[PDB]
Write a protein that binds this ligand. Sequence first.
Ligand SMILES: Nc1cc(-c2ccc3ccn(Cc4ccc(CN5CCCC5)cc4)c3c2)n[nH]1
Ligand SMILES: Nc1cc(-c2ccc3ccn(Cc4ccc(CN5CCCC5)cc4)c3c2)n[nH]1
Lengths: 202, 212
Amino acid sequence: SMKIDVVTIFPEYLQPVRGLVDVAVHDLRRWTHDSVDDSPYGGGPGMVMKPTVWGDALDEICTSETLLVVPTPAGYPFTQETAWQWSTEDHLVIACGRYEGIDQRVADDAATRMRVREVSIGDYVLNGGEAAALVIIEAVLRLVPGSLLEGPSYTRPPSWRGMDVPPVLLSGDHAKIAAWRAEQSRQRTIERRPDLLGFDSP
Amino acid sequence: SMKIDVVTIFPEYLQPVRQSLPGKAIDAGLVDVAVHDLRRWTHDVHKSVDDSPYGGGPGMVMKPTVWGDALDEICTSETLLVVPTPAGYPFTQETAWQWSTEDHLVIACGRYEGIDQRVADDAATRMRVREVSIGDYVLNGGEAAALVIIEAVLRLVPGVLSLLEGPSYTRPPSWRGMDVPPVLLSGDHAKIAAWRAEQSRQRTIERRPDLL
Ligand SMILES: Nc1cc(-c2ccc3ccn(Cc4ccc(CN5CCCC5)cc4)c3c2)n[nH]1
Ligand SMILES: Nc1cc(-c2ccc3ccn(Cc4ccc(CN5CCCC5)cc4)c3c2)n[nH]1
C-alpha cells in the first residue's frame, strides 16, 4: 500500500500517471499568496525556485514518515536498487523543480524532519523534475507487492523478410537455450555496457 | 527543423510532450512531434501486437510483422530510429547533443518485454538505428523513455522549449533558520566562483565518485 504525492507547477504534465496505490498531483502555486522563482544569489543565468512556497506546500503534504524525493541533475543516481528500496515505502513525495532548480534550503529544512533523497535518473539534462517523476513512479510501482543486459527476444513467424529466429530457440532444448541466452546477455553487456562487468567505458 | 514520430500502443502517454511545445516553434516550423498508435498497423481483427517468446519464458514479445509495416510507412533513409530498451547503449547528454541536429527522429516504444530483435536488425540495413537505455532501472515500456529523450533533445534545439552543479539560493536571505551562504552576497565574484567550484567538487565526491 503506497501513497505518492507529486508537487509541480505543471500538473498537466503528470497526466500519463493513469487500489493498492494512490497517486495525487498538486499544483505548487496553490500555496502562493500574490511568483515562485527569483534570480540566484551570487549571480548566474536563469532563476531559482523560492524556498517559501515549497516550505508551505511540503509542510501540508509531508509527515516524518515521508520519503521526500527531489529530482535533480546533481542528485545521487536513481537505480533499480533504489526502485526496490522505495517500493516498500508508505509515502513518497516527489518535489518537481523547474527553471534552474530549487533553493537548497528546501531540501535541507525537510531533512530535519524527514528522510530526503536528491536523485538523478541519468546523465542528461531535463527541463524540470516532471519527466523524472514519471520515470521514478513507473520504475517503483511495477515493483510494489501485488547486473547484466538482457539478450534479444523473438516471436512468430520463425522466418521473416529472410531473417530467421536463431535455430536454438526452436530446438526446444531448455539447457542449450538457457546457455545461448546467457551468452547473448554477456555479449551484449560487453558491447554496450562494459562497465557492468568491470571494464573501461569506450 | 526537426520531425519526431513516436510509435506506441499508448499514444495518450505522449500527450505531455505535444502540449509542452510552444506554438511559436511549431509555427516557425522548427519542430513537429507526431504520435502514432501502433495498432493502426495490426493485421487481425483482435489488433494483436504481441505473441509468445521463442525459447519460452515469461512475458510476451512484440510482433515483428506489425512493427515492420509501421516503420516502413513512417521511416525514410534519413531517419534516426531510436528504440528505448533496458539493454540499450546509454543515452547521455552527448547523445542528446548529437540527436538535436537530426532532421527526423522516429522513436519506437516497446511494451510487454520488448520488440522482436529482427525489427531493429532489419531497419538497420537501410537506416541508422540506436537502441538506448535512459538509466539502470526497468520501466514498463518505452514511453517514459521517449518523454525523457524528447525533452533532453528538444531543449538543445534553439528556441523549441565534468562535475555536478552545487547548491542554488534565492530570496529570502534567511529562511527557517538557514542563511544563504554569506560569500554569495559578498560582491567578490572571483571568490564566489571558487566557492561554487569547491561546492561542485565536494558534491561530486559525495554523490558521484564515478565522475572522478
Ligand atoms: N537526471 C536529471 C534530472 C533533471 C532535472 C531535475 C529537476 C529539474 C528542475 C529544473 N531542471 C532543469 C535544469 C536544472 C539545472 C540546469 C543547470 N545545470 C547546470 C549543468 C547542468 C544543468 C539546467 C536545467 C531540472 C532537471 N535532469 N536530468
Ligand atoms: N532505461 C530503460 C528502458 C526501459 C524500457 C524500454 C522499452 C521497454 C519495452 C518493455 N519494457 C519493459 C520490460 C520489462 C521487463 C523486461 C525483462 N527484462 C529482463 C530483466 C531485466 C528486464 C524487459 C522490458 C521496456 C523497458 N526500461 N528502462
